[PDB]
């Protein structure tokens, strides 16, 4: 079965809204979310619907852009690196679980190319 999704709410976690986090939502998330290959990454992997009974036996730090979107919109993060790490965890999980050349891997690679381009232009913290 599916585990509980990653936390998007935690009142005693300290939160910030920085210019870098604003960029991560307005530029980085927005660019990847609208892409034709975004759909497998817009919500947690559903191991039941996709018939992947081993997915969460293997992937112990799941992450997806639906979770990231919620974290950004609900000001879950303290800094940009936390969010950047979530994106990189999402990509790494996909490359670890799946085989090279699979459709899902080609989709992640295209999203990751855009992610890297946008992260290269991350503004200096103000």
């Amino acid at each position: 079965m599916n585990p509980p999704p990653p936390e998007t709410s935690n009142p005693n976690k300290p939160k910030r809204q920085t210019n870098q986090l604003q960029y991560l939502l307005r530029v980085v998330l927005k660019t990847l979310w609208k892409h034709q290959f975004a759909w497998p990454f817009q919500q947690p992997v559903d191991a039941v619907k996709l018939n992947l009974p081993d997915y969460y036996k293997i992937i112990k730090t799941p992450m997806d852009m639906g979770t990231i979107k919620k974290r950004l919109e609900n000001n879950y993060y303290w800094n940009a690196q936390e969010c950047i790490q979530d994106f990189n965890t999402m990509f790494t999980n996909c490359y670890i679980y799946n085989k090279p050349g699979d459709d899902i891997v080609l989709m992640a690679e295209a999203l990751e190319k855009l992610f890297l381009q946008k992260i290269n232009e991350l503004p200096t913290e103000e």
Binding site: L52, Y97, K99, D102, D103, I104
Partner: peptide, 5 residues
């Protein structure tokens, strides 16, 4: 095999 196969 494949995720969607």
């Amino acid at each position: 095999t494949g995720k969607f196969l």
